Amino acid sequence: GCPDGWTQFLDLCYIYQSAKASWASAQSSCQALGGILAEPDTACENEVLIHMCKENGDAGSFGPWLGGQKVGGAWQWSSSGAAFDYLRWGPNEPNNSGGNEDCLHYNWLSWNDLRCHYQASYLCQRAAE
Numbered sequence: 001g002c003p004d005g006w007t008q009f010l011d012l013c014y015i016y017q018s019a020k021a022s023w024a025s026a027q028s029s030c031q032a033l034g035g036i037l038a039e040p041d042t043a044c045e046n047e048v049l050i051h052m053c054k055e056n057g058d059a060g061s062f063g064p065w066l067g068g069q070k071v072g073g074a075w076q077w078s079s080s081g082a083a084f085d086y087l088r089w090g091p092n093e094p095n096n097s098g099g100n101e102d103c104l105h106y107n108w109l110s111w112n113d114l115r116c117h118y119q120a121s122y123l124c125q126r127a128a129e
């Protein structure tokens with residue numbers, strides 16, 4: 001199971017945090033909560049997280065942080081350092097607007113690259129116990 005108030009999906013537990021934070025601050029928080037920024041690596045995981053965004057009024061622009069980051073020019077999941085396999089980029093993304101969009105978030109319920117110190121809400125994930 002999951003702690004109270006978290007959303008179970010299979011062997012994962014998710015939670016939406018509304019407080020606005022940089023990617024790094026959001027990560028540290030999720031780590032404090034015993035987990036990581038959410039890493040939707042499957043279609044079904046992404047559906048669950050998008051539904052959480054809708055639930056929390058964050059289905060528009062500047063939606064919540066996810067655990068992907070661009071490191072050395074390539075995108076990776078920050079928990080493992082693994083490259084992406086499954087991708088859910090929105091149209092024309094990642095567009096590197098401004099040349100410094102190095103963190104992953106939801107923008108209109110699709111993946112987008114955004115500057116890492118934009119202050120967005122965030123999704124955490126932890127293993128079910």
Ligand SMILES: [Ca+2]
Nearest residue numbers: 095096112113
């Ligand atoms: Ca972008």
